[PDB]
Design a protein around this motif. Structure first.
Motif, PDB file in Angstrom:
ATOM      1  N   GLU A   1     119.473  11.255  81.510  1.00 52.30           N
ATOM      2  CA  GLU A   1     120.288  10.077  81.766  1.00 52.30           C
ATOM      3  C   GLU A   1     121.492  10.373  82.646  1.00 52.30           C
ATOM      4  O   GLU A   1     122.141   9.431  83.111  1.00 52.30           O
ATOM      5  N   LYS A   2     121.807  11.645  82.887  1.00 51.00           N
ATOM      6  CA  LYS A   2     122.952  12.030  83.700  1.00 51.00           C
ATOM      7  C   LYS A   2     122.557  12.428  85.115  1.00 51.00           C
ATOM      8  O   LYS A   2     123.376  13.004  85.836  1.00 51.00           O
ATOM      9  N   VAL A   3     121.324  12.142  85.528  1.00 49.15           N
ATOM     10  CA  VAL A   3     120.847  12.465  86.866  1.00 49.15           C
ATOM     11  C   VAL A   3     120.020  11.301  87.389  1.00 49.15           C
ATOM     12  O   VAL A   3     119.312  10.629  86.634  1.00 49.15           O
TER      13      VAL A   3
ATOM     14  N   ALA B   1     137.075  -0.794  92.315  1.00 48.73           N
ATOM     15  CA  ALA B   1     135.905  -0.294  91.615  1.00 48.73           C
ATOM     16  C   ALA B   1     135.543  -1.250  90.490  1.00 48.73           C
ATOM     17  O   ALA B   1     136.420  -1.736  89.770  1.00 48.73           O
ATOM     18  N   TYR B   2     134.251  -1.522  90.345  1.00 49.28           N
ATOM     19  CA  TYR B   2     133.775  -2.436  89.321  1.00 49.28           C
ATOM     20  C   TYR B   2     132.692  -1.776  88.482  1.00 49.28           C
ATOM     21  O   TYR B   2     131.847  -1.038  88.995  1.00 49.28           O
ATOM     22  N   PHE B   3     132.740  -2.056  87.183  1.00 45.94           N
ATOM     23  CA  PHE B   3     131.931  -1.415  86.161  1.00 45.94           C
ATOM     24  C   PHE B   3     131.101  -2.479  85.468  1.00 45.94           C
ATOM     25  O   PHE B   3     131.483  -3.650  85.430  1.00 45.94           O
ATOM     26  N   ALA B   4     129.999  -2.053  84.862  1.00 41.12           N
ATOM     27  CA  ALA B   4     129.272  -2.860  83.893  1.00 41.12           C
ATOM     28  C   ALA B   4     129.495  -2.257  82.516  1.00 41.12           C
ATOM     29  O   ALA B   4     129.365  -1.042  82.342  1.00 41.12           O
ATOM     30  N   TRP B   5     129.833  -3.100  81.544  1.00 35.99           N
ATOM     31  CA  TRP B   5     130.258  -2.653  80.227  1.00 35.99           C
ATOM     32  C   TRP B   5     129.354  -3.230  79.148  1.00 35.99           C
ATOM     33  O   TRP B   5     128.863  -4.357  79.265  1.00 35.99           O
ATOM     34  N   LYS B   6     129.128  -2.441  78.096  1.00 32.73           N
ATOM     35  CA  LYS B   6     128.627  -2.998  76.845  1.00 32.73           C
ATOM     36  C   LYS B   6     129.755  -3.673  76.081  1.00 32.73           C
ATOM     37  O   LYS B   6     129.634  -4.827  75.659  1.00 32.73           O
ATOM     38  N   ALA B   7     130.860  -2.960  75.903  1.00 34.70           N
ATOM     39  CA  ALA B   7     132.052  -3.497  75.271  1.00 34.70           C
ATOM     40  C   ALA B   7     133.220  -2.607  75.656  1.00 34.70           C
ATOM     41  O   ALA B   7     133.060  -1.398  75.828  1.00 34.70           O
ATOM     42  N   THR B   8     134.390  -3.214  75.798  1.00 36.18           N
ATOM     43  CA  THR B   8     135.558  -2.454  76.214  1.00 36.18           C
ATOM     44  C   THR B   8     136.822  -3.165  75.770  1.00 36.18           C
ATOM     45  O   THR B   8     136.805  -4.341  75.403  1.00 36.18           O
TER      46      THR B   8
ATOM     47  N   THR C   1     137.798   3.138  70.631  1.00 36.37           N
ATOM     48  CA  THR C   1     137.301   3.848  69.453  1.00 36.37           C
ATOM     49  C   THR C   1     136.754   2.868  68.422  1.00 36.37           C
ATOM     50  O   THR C   1     135.684   3.091  67.840  1.00 36.37           O
ATOM     51  N   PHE C   2     137.471   1.768  68.193  1.00 39.91           N
ATOM     52  CA  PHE C   2     137.004   0.761  67.250  1.00 39.91           C
ATOM     53  C   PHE C   2     135.676   0.169  67.693  1.00 39.91           C
ATOM     54  O   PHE C   2     134.784  -0.063  66.871  1.00 39.91           O
ATOM     55  N   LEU C   3     135.534  -0.103  68.990  1.00 43.65           N
ATOM     56  CA  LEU C   3     134.284  -0.659  69.487  1.00 43.65           C
ATOM     57  C   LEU C   3     133.154   0.356  69.402  1.00 43.65           C
ATOM     58  O   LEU C   3     132.008  -0.021  69.152  1.00 43.65           O
ATOM     59  N   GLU C   4     133.450   1.639  69.595  1.00 48.13           N
ATOM     60  CA  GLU C   4     132.433   2.659  69.370  1.00 48.13           C
ATOM     61  C   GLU C   4     131.968   2.638  67.922  1.00 48.13           C
ATOM     62  O   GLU C   4     130.768   2.745  67.644  1.00 48.13           O
ATOM     63  N   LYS C   5     132.907   2.499  66.987  1.00 46.56           N
ATOM     64  CA  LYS C   5     132.538   2.455  65.575  1.00 46.56           C
ATOM     65  C   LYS C   5     131.695   1.226  65.256  1.00 46.56           C
ATOM     66  O   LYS C   5     130.657   1.327  64.592  1.00 46.56           O
TER      67      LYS C   5
ATOM     68  N   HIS D   1     129.460   7.390  79.689  1.00 43.19           N
ATOM     69  CA  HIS D   1     129.901   6.846  78.409  1.00 43.19           C
ATOM     70  C   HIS D   1     128.831   5.947  77.804  1.00 43.19           C
ATOM     71  O   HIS D   1     128.135   5.219  78.514  1.00 43.19           O
ATOM     72  N   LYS D   2     128.695   6.014  76.478  1.00 43.93           N
ATOM     73  CA  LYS D   2     127.665   5.246  75.789  1.00 43.93           C
ATOM     74  C   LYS D   2     127.938   3.749  75.805  1.00 43.93           C
ATOM     75  O   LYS D   2     127.002   2.962  75.639  1.00 43.93           O
ATOM     76  N   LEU D   3     129.192   3.339  75.987  1.00 47.05           N
ATOM     77  CA  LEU D   3     129.532   1.923  76.034  1.00 47.05           C
ATOM     78  C   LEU D   3     129.346   1.315  77.418  1.00 47.05           C
ATOM     79  O   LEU D   3     129.464   0.095  77.559  1.00 47.05           O
ATOM     80  N   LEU D   4     129.077   2.124  78.437  1.00 44.63           N
ATOM     81  CA  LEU D   4     128.770   1.587  79.753  1.00 44.63           C
ATOM     82  C   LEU D   4     127.379   0.977  79.768  1.00 44.63           C
ATOM     83  O   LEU D   4     126.450   1.489  79.139  1.00 44.63           O
ATOM     84  N   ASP D   5     127.233  -0.115  80.505  1.00 45.08           N
ATOM     85  CA  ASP D   5     125.930  -0.708  80.739  1.00 45.08           C
ATOM     86  C   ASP D   5     125.296  -0.089  81.980  1.00 45.08           C
ATOM     87  O   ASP D   5     125.948   0.596  82.769  1.00 45.08           O
ATOM     88  N   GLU D   6     124.000  -0.338  82.147  1.00 49.81           N
ATOM     89  CA  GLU D   6     123.252   0.205  83.274  1.00 49.81           C
ATOM     90  C   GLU D   6     122.761  -0.926  84.165  1.00 49.81           C
ATOM     91  O   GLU D   6     121.593  -0.943  84.567  1.00 49.81           O
TER      92      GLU D   6
END
Lengths: 50, 139, 258, 316, 233, 221, 241
Positions: free
Chosen positions: C206-208, E153-160, E171-175, C50-55
């Motif tokens: 980016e997917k590998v 499970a833990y994630f790193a996010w730009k926004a969520t 969807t709003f955050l994607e926009k 997903h594009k909103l995930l950070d790396e």
């Protein structure tokens, strides 16, 4: 069935604009509209598995 | 036997909607709350379904719902629905119809042979607050 | 019904819960590994990009167990984290005791014994994670192992776990040179098999994620290839595929002339 | 930049009272050069350029904007990063907003586009082309507007600034509506809406989309209920932005109310919470038309038309 | 579906599902909306503090709570489980501080809290934490925004966004979200994302927002939230 | 070690010396002996350096978790009771003698906690090897409700007397002035002594030492 | 979904804890009701008192307990669970005063009890004891405080609350009475609480069929009003209403 639906939906796009004409844009939009996937909503349930 | 019989019902429906006996001029409409649990065969983007979404009313659509529901009804001149539409909420079309009916019932019950902004305010509050009285540790 | 507990034998002698874990490993992102006489390497797909995930982390599936070993995880995230921490602990306990890196087979055996205990004892579901280990030890040099939820491990020249592992392993079987494979050829083969197994449009870089372990100046080096290098490998593979398609088109034209 | 801000405030007071002194001061400040290392004198100069253009627009001195562009284009070409287009866009918009027709707009916008193409500022060039298409539509050169807009949208479908793509598609739909090709106008509108419901639509863009959708619905489907809904959405958006294109949305809502054979609601809607700041001949024209329709009097209808010729007629 | 394999947490269903943890995640998704946006120079967390009545003193129980001078945490899900997890997070941060005389990195705190959740999701006599945590820290010189799930499970996010309308929020955050977003703009984006899923009038005292910049995590005062709401509207 | 504390009008002033001796040789010249417990609580440590350091660190962590839980400033009574109970659980082997001081809602509080876990809430306290000299100065020149500057001067002079009359006392004087508003942490408040201006010139030129091997390793960037 | 119902630790497919909900139903099982209201400088708890026998010692019958010198509670639900949780609250307050040297804040004691209850809701060792505790005290920096400690770990603070059979009716009544001049005095708060109970129960109170506990800023010690004081309040306020 998906391909037949693609043809049908491109034809419906043509019908909408009082047309009897189908173009590459019409087929592409039909493909998008017909092969619409309801992928998983929740990132948690999506990321349970590595 | 029960799950198998339900699957049998679905299989018969698939059969009859698209099979060896292609129907002529027989159209089908199926209404559902979610299409994600639907069988891929019945959901087949082919000779079995074309999919449409009926979302919750937008603000503009809510304006239209109020106008349509109230056209047959008659009200005062200071009872503008023009801001009850703008007030944020997730009220559906059924909710708006219930609001209008409840405000009319309020007026008739209390005589007061007009429907006014106070009646709509009370009905709107009642309908919007109806979705409560749940448990508060869940949130 | 012979699968309500991990410690229950089917009347045929099968541990249905262990088999369930083994099958469930199939949900995990495709990881694979190739052994080359120059070095060893893993590749792995990012299931969710997903594009909103950070790396934030430099690697999601490939972990560095110690100086001379790395491992790719495929399965439940919580179990994978637990087992990665336990692998690091086992390796460092061995290093504390003996003052030399744990051999790869010994580390694999230790973790697989933990997994076996989980499959055998009481009310504990088996670890739903498969592992691919790569390493270098003074005894057998570059080694690649695979370990199952059941605590069974094997040594492989090339293998694949996770999604489409059957297709990937068949492709490696077809196109792996048993004793004449270098690291460059291994990377090319990894890109090929990932492209043919991911089954998602073009091979987005980016997917590998790819990691390579090699000996250098007497010290093992584990490098997770940068996205630039991954993109270059993918571009070279795409050029090779385009060249093959051009050759096939030319053959078709010659056949048409004939 | 305390001294610079003091100079700005002096120029502002002179803009308010003695505009020519402000004009000369800002001309000198723009002529001033900028140290390459200092990144604040650059802001001072850009602000001075903007305020000089503001002085020209306020005084009606729109003849110098060409020179402004000519001697501000040879710039460092690094304002902010990839957002310097905003300043030039606002400058050109204010220039073309002239209250008196200077007569040199199309060719000036064309040379702006040519300069952008030469400099290789693609995004600024796209913005200038969209502005030129809107200018063509405003000056009623519909065929050229459509040609340029088709070229621009063909270019734009395959890259970024989907907001600009939406604006260009809306302009295409609007030019079709002006040219009477209603089915093609509706197709362009639907394409614009499909693209717009995938990005952030500022209130102004959403209001423009809603007003165009209402116009097309009034024109083609004869669902004046939906036309009125879209016109109200446009009115609300333009009211939030306090834009001057809100009297038009109000006029069109009253028109939809009239054509729905319910002219009694025209007065009730003009006597609304939001329909008070816009009271005037604009709303009075349609109040009179609703009254004439209620009385069903053709003589009264024609009397209203001739009395309010400015409001009811000259707006197609 | 696999009906038998949904009451236990120590058995794989024939297809490999751990159904009970997915049910915990459903409990999470059926919670109050919360949003987290990682600005360029900071992070912002928001969550509706809408009360079930005027009687609830909406100044006593907070939902956006600090864990260190540079880490804060919001949640979507059950409040009691959230209290347990915030206490455990504070304890873990303090243990890390005592061992290493250095504030715990946000990534490490997230790892350890996820480990706690894993501990709670590995037996039959224990219920998985029915919350999802959004941790926001300023370790190093860059901001961090992480999510932690009941599954461990833990994630790193730009926004969520998480809670009732997380789909609309995402969807709003994607926009609206762009990477080079200052914290001041990210606060407006957070409040707008909340508004898009916030029924009723978003008054300053029924919404809770916490920022995390280089000065450290801080829950914005209701006066500041009122100012931001007025500026947005 | 010399530490002292006095409760003045608005708040408290703590003052410590800076030195740690390993036996009878000055090991540290700038040891920090005023440890942080909370923004309004500081404690001066004396005795076994490691014991006092880790005790104050643990109590600071406990009090900070307490403050995060409650939501209000911590109390000097809370810090004192935590320290007292810990030092009592350890029958005296935690050789950490502390001078606690803070300003909570209920005014300023100053405690003298001893290694065995016996605390004396007092207006002014002194502890460490030079505690006797510091208390001499305090008794001679202490008054109720002194101003902030006068209290700083008094505690500084007491610590200076400790420095000059107790072997094993610091080089520099550190202060901590706490009140309901300010949290000044003066480090160092004064430098009563400094190493005599280096009179020698002894730097040996390159090549004086005889090498045998070299293994220069070029670290990567 | 009835399979996910016999165990406190099982999530329903939609994520619900039916056994916790049933603990709340157990709260609504003693028949009694309780109300609490805070004024400017006082807090008041009033509980319906049923003594359906001449042989039952009304002095021993009660639901108002003194958790500490300056904190009081009214318990509603099963009586054994109520007394067990009251003992736990007293023990926690004593431990707080021992460890930290100052009286436990009311909100802190509520958080402690709520955490204790959440532990039972998470692990499967006990049943979540089905009682609701409403605590009142005077905080030196905040002022009068009223809190709840429902049996799921939820403990929000309140301007005015109710518990028991008629909690919803009492909540509506108190919402209406607090939207208008929430600023109440001591007498006005006692009026509001007693009137809320009387109106929701549809009965006028004898001085004995009601129990009131009060804390005030001037006198911040939990005091249980005597029969004479209750009668004085009822008569005077009914007369001057």
């Amino acid at each position: 069935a998906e391909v037949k639906g693609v043809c049908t939906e491109a034809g419906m796009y043509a019908l909408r604009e009082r047309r009897v004409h189908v173009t590459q844009e019409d087929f592409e939009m039909a493909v998008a509209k017909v092969m619409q996937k309801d992928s998983e909503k929740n990132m948690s349930i999506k990321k349970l598995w590595k | 036997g029960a799950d198998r019989e339900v699957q049998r019902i679905l299989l018969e429906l698939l059969n009859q909607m698209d099979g060896f006996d292609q129907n002529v001029n027989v159209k089908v409409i199926m209404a559902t709350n979610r299409a994600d649990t639907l069988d891929p065969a019945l959901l087949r983007p082919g000779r079995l379904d074309r999919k449409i979404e009926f979302p919750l009313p937008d603000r503009r659509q809510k304006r239209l719902i109020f106008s349509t529901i109230t056209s047959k009804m008659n009200l005062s001149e200071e009872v503008d629905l023009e801001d009850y539409v703008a007030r944020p909420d997730k009220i559906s079309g059924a909710d708006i119809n219930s609001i209008c009916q409840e405000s009319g019932m309020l007026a008739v019950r209390e005589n007061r042979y007009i429907v006014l902004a106070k009646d709509f305010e009370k009905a709107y509050k009642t309908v919007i607050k109806k979705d409560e009285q749940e448990h508060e540790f869940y949130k | 019904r012979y699968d309500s507990r991990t410690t229950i034998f089917s009347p045929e002698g099968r541990l249905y819960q262990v088999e369930y874990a083994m099958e469930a490993i199939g949900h995990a992102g495709t990881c694979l590994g190739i052994l080359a006489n120059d070095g060893v390497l893993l590749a792995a797909e990012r299931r969710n990009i997903h594009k909103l995930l950070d790396e934030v982390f430099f690697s999601e599936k490939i972990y560095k167990l110690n100086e001379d070993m790395a491992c790719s995880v495929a399965g439940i995230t919580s179990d994978a984290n637990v087992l990665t921490n336990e692998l690091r602990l086992i390796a460092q306990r061995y290093l504390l005791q003996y003052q030399e890196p744990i051999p790869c087979e010994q580390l694999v055996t230790a973790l697989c014994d933990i997994k076996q205990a989980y499959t055998q004892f009481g009310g504990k579901r088996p670890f739903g994670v498969s592992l691919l280990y790569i390493g270098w030890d003074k005894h057998y040099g570059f080694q690649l192992y695979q370990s199952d939820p059941s605590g069974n491990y094997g040594g492989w020249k090339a293998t694949c776990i996770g999604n489409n592992s059957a297709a990937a392993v068949s492709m490696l079987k077809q196109d792996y040179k048993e004793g004449e494979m270098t690291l460059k050829s291994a990377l090319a083969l990894a890109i090929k098999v990932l492209n043919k197994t991911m089954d998602v449009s073009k091979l987005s870089a980016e997917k590998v994620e790819i990691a390579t372990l090699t000996r250098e100046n007497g010290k093992t080096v584990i490098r997770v290839l940068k996205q630039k290098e991954v993109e270059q490998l993918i571009k070279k593979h795409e050029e090779e595929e385009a060249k093959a398609e051009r050759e096939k088109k030319e053959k078709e034209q010659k056949e048409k002339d004939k | 930049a305390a001294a610079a801000v003091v100079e700005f405030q002096r120029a502002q007071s002179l803009l308010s009272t003695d505009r020519e002194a402000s004009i000369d001061i800002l001309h000198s400040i723009v002529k001033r050069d900028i140290q390459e290392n200092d990144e604040e004198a650059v802001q001072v100069k850009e602000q001075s350029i903007l305020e000089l253009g503001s002085l020209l627009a306020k005084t009606g001195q729109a003849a110098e904007l060409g020179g402004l562009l000519k001697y501000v284009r040879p710039f460092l070409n690094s304002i902010s990063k990839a957002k310097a287009a905003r300043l030039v866009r606002s400058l050109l918009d204010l220039f073309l907003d002239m209250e008196a027709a200077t007569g040199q707009e199309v060719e000036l916008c064309l040379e702006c586009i040519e300069w952008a193409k030469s400099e290789k500022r693609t995004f600024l060039r796209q913005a200038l082309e969209a502005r030129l298409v809107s200018l063509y539509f405003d000056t009623k050169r519909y065929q050229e507007a459509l040609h340029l807009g088709s070229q621009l949208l063909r270019e734009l479908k395959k890259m970024d600034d989907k907001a600009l793509l939406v604006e260009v598609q809306l302009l295409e739909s609007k030019t079709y509506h002006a040219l009477s090709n209603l089915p093609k106008a509706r197709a362009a509108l639907t394409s614009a809406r499909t693209t717009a419901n995938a990005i952030y639509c500022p209130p102004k863009l959403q209001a423009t989309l809603d007003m165009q959708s209402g116009i097309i619905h009034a024109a083609e489907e004869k669902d004046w209920k939906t036309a009125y809904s879209y016109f109200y959405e446009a009115f609300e958006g333009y009211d939030s932005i306090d834009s001057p294109k809100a009297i038009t949305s109000l006029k069109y809502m009253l028109l939809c109310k009239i054509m729905l054979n319910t002219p009694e609601d025209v007065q009730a809607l003009v006597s609304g919470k939001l329909a008070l700041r816009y009271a005037g001949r604009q709303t009075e024209a349609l109040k009179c038309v609703a009254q004439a329709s209620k009385n069903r009097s053709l003589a009264d209808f024609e009397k209203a038309l001739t009395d309010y010729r400015a409001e009811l007629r000259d707006d197609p | 579906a696999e009906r038998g394999y949904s009451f236990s947490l120590t058995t794989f269903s024939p297809s490999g599902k751990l159904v009970q943890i997915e049910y915990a995640l459903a409990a999470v998704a059926g919670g109050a909306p919360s949003v987290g946006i990682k600005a360029a120079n900071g992070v912002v967390l928001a969550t509706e503090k809408k009360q079930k009545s005027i009687l609830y003193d909406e100044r006593s129980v907070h939902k956006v709570e600090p864990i260190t001078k540079h880490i804060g945490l919001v949640y979507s899900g059950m409040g009691p489980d959230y209290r347990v997890l915030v206490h455990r997070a504070r304890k873990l941060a303090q243990q890390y501080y005592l061992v290493y005389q250095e504030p715990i990195p946000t990534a490490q705190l997230v790892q350890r809290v996820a480990s706690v959740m894993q501990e709670y999701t590995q037996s039959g006599g224990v219920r998985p934490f029915g919350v999802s945590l959004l941790i926001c820290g300023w370790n190093e010189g860059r901001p961090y925004l992480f999510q932690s799930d009941p599954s461990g499970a833990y994630f790193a996010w730009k926004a969520t966004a998480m809670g009732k309308n997380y789909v609309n929020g995402k969807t709003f955050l994607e926009k609206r979200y762009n990477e080079d977003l200052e914290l001041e703009d990210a606060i407006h984006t957070a409040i707008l994302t909340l508004k898009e899923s916030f029924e009723g009038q978003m008054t300053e005292d029924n919404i809770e927002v916490g920022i995390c910049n280089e000065a450290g995590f801080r829950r914005l005062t209701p006066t500041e939230v009122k100012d931001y709401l007025a500026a947005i509207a | 070690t010399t530490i002292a504390g006095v409760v003045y009008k608005d708040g408290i002033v703590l003052g410590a010396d800076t030195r740690a001796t390993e036996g009878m040789v000055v090991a540290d010249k700038n040891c920090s002996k005023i440890h942080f417990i909370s923004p309004n609580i500081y404690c001066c440590g004396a005795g076994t350096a490691a014991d006092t350091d880790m005790t104050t660190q643990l109590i600071s962590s406990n009090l900070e978790l307490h403050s995060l839980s409650t939501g209000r400033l911590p109390r000097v009574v809370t810090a004192n009771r935590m320290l007292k109970q810990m030092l009592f659980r350890y029958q005296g082997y935690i050789g950490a003698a502390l001078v606690l001081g803070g300003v909570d809602v209920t005014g300023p509080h100053l405690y003298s906690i001893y290694p065995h876990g016996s605390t004396d809430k007092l207006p002014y306290v002194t502890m460490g090897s030079g505690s006797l000299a510091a208390m001499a100065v305090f008794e001679d020149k202490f008054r109720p409700d002194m101003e902030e500057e006068e209290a700083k001067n008094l505690v500084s002079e007491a610590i200076a007397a400790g420095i000059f009359n107790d072997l094993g006392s610091g080089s520099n004087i550190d202060l901590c002035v706490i009140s309901k508003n300010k949290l000044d942490f003066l480090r160092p408040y004064t430098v009563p002594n400094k190493k005599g201006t280096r009179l020698g010139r002894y730097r040996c030129e390159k090549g004086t030492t005889a090498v045998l091997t070299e293994k220069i390793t070029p670290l990567e960037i | 979904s009835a399979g996910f119902d016999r165990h406190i630790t099982i999530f329903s497919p939609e994520g619900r804890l039916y056994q916790v909900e049933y603990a709340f139903k157990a709260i609504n099982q003693g028949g009694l009701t309780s109300v609490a209201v805070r004024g400017k400088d006082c807090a008041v708890i009033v509980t319906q008192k049923k003594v359906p026998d001449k042989l039952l010692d009304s002095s021993t019958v009660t639901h108002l307990f003194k958790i500490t010198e300056n904190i009081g509670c009214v318990m509603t639900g099963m009586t054994a669970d109520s007394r067990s949780q009251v003992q736990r609250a007293r023990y926690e307050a004593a431990n707080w005063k021992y460890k930290y040297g100052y009286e436990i804040p009311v909100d802190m004691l509520c958080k402690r009890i709520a955490d204790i209850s959440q532990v039972y809701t998470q692990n499967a060792e006990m049943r979540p004891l089905g009682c609701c505790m409403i605590l009142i005290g005077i905080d030196e920096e905040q002022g009068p405080q009223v809190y709840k400690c429902d049996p799921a770990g939820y403990y929000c603070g309140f301007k005015a609350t109710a518990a028991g059979v008629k909690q919803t009716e009492s909540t509506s009544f108190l919402e209406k009475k607090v939207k208008k001049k929430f600023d109440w005095t001591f007498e006005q708060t006692v009026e509001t609480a007693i009137t809320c109970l009387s109106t929701v129960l549809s009965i006028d109170f004898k001085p004995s069929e009601i129990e009131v506990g009060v804390v005030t800023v001037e006198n911040p010690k939990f005091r249980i009003l005597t029969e004479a004081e209750i009668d004085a309040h009822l008569v005077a306020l009914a007369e001057r209403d």
